[PDB]
């Protein structure tokens, strides 16, 4: 796997979204991974619908929280997920209104990365593309991050609370990091992204709950 890879430079990443006051991070994390694969497969990069997920995944709890794995299964069984245009994000839970004529993508499963294995996470990013990951984003240092490779010894590998997207990896000024796309808008972090510590003992549980869909 290359020493560094940024899928943004490859055009596998859609612009940063804002989940608003809805706990839909799992939906945005899921959508980002699917958008990455849709690109790999069809050559087109389109915005998929996180709202479709929020309203339709009964195994998850809409704005109350959920898992990316449940989301991928829903897309697989549903046999499709609508585009952002066919199913706009409102940021509130509503009855499932899936429209098959707005179907932009499909899913045939998901693969999970071994718990805590950052080497596996790396191998996966360099081969498949953007991977969905869960981290502990409760620290106020994470909240106010603006630049550099983020790392705070207070981060909790066993307190995963935020779903996010691993969009690449590399090294800054001697510090290896993961390129993480957040869903807290552009005004957050570095234009919506954060460089998180790579190989520093599974920083924030970055490699504890990762997965990606198969098409
Ligand atoms: C994240 C956010 O919107 O900021 C949102 O709280 C969320 O979905 N968080 C996840 C975090 C990781 C997946 C650990 C979460 O808490 N998921 C599990 C919540 C339990 C809900 N129960 C199920 N299975 N529907």
From Swiss-Prot:
Q: Biological process GO terms, please? A: bone resorption; collagen catabolic process; extracellular matrix disassembly; mitophagy; negative regulation of cartilage development; proteolysis; proteolysis involved in protein catabolic process; thyroid hormone generation
Q: Where does the record say this protein resides?
A: Lysosome; Secreted; Apical cell membrane
Q: Which organism is it from?
A: Homo sapiens
User: What is this protein's name?
Assistant: Cathepsin K
In what way does this protein cross or attach to the membrane? Peripheral membrane protein
Keywords on record: Cell membrane, Disease variant, Disulfide bond, Glycoprotein, Hydrolase, Lysosome, Membrane, Protease, Secreted, Signal, Thiol protease, Zymogen
The main enzyme category here is hydrolase
Span within the parent record? 115 to 329 of 329
Disulfide cross-links: 22-63, 56-96, 155-204
Tell me which EC number(s) this protein carries: 3.4.22.38
Q: Which residues of this protein are catalytic?
A: 25, 162, 182
Disease tied to this entry: Pycnodysostosis: A rare autosomal recessive bone disorder characterized by deformity of the skull, maxilla and phalanges, osteosclerosis, and fragility of bone.
Tissue localization of expression is: Predominantly expressed in osteoclasts (bones). Expressed in thyroid epithelial cells.
Q: What family is it from? A: Belongs to the peptidase C1 family.
Which GO terms label this protein's molecular function in UniProt?
Answer: collagen binding; cysteine-type endopeptidase activity; cysteine-type peptidase activity; fibronectin binding; proteoglycan binding; serine-type endopeptidase activity
GO CC aspect terms: apical plasma membrane; endolysosome lumen; external side of plasma membrane; extracellular region; extracellular space; intracellular membrane-bounded organelle; lysosomal lumen; lysosome
Describe its function.
Thiol protease involved in osteoclastic bone resorption and may participate partially in the disorder of bone remodeling. Displays potent endoprotease activity against fibrinogen at acid pH. May play an important role in extracellular matrix degradation. Involved in the release of thyroid hormone thyroxine (T4) by limited proteolysis of TG/thyroglobulin in the thyroid follicle lumen.
Q: Which reaction does it catalyse?
A: Broad proteolytic activity. With small-molecule substrates and inhibitors, the major determinant of specificity is P2, which is preferably Leu, Met > Phe, and not Arg
Principal location? other
């Amino acid at each position: 796997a290359p020493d560094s890879v940024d899928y943004r430079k490859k055009g596998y990443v859609t612009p940063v979204k804002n989940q608003g006051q809805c706990g839909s991070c799992w939906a945005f994390s899921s959508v980002g991974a699917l958008e990455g694969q849709l690109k790999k497969k069809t050559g087109k990069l389109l915005n998929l619908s996180p709202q479709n997920l929020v309203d339709c995944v009964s195994e998850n709890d809409g704005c109350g929280g959920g898992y990316m794995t449940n989301a991928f299964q829903y897309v697989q069984k549903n046999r499709g997920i609508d585009s952002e245009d066919a199913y706009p994000y409102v940021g509130q839970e509503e009855s499932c209104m899936y429209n098959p004529t707005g179907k932009a993508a499909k899913c045939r499963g998901y693969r999970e990365i071994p718990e805590g294995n950052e080497k596996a996470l790396k191998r996966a990013v360099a081969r498949v593309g953007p991977v969905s990951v869960a981290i502990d984003a409760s620290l106020t240092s994470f909240q106010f991050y603006s630049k550099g490779v983020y790392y705070d010894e207070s981060c909790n590998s066993d307190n995963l609370n935020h779903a996010v997207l691993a969009v690449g990896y590399g090294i800054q000024k001697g510090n290896k990091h993961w390129i993480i796309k957040n869903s807290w808008g552009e005004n957050w972090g570095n234009k919506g992204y954060i460089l998180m510590a790579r190989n520093k003992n599974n920083a924030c549980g970055i490699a504890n709950l990762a997965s990606f869909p198969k098409m």
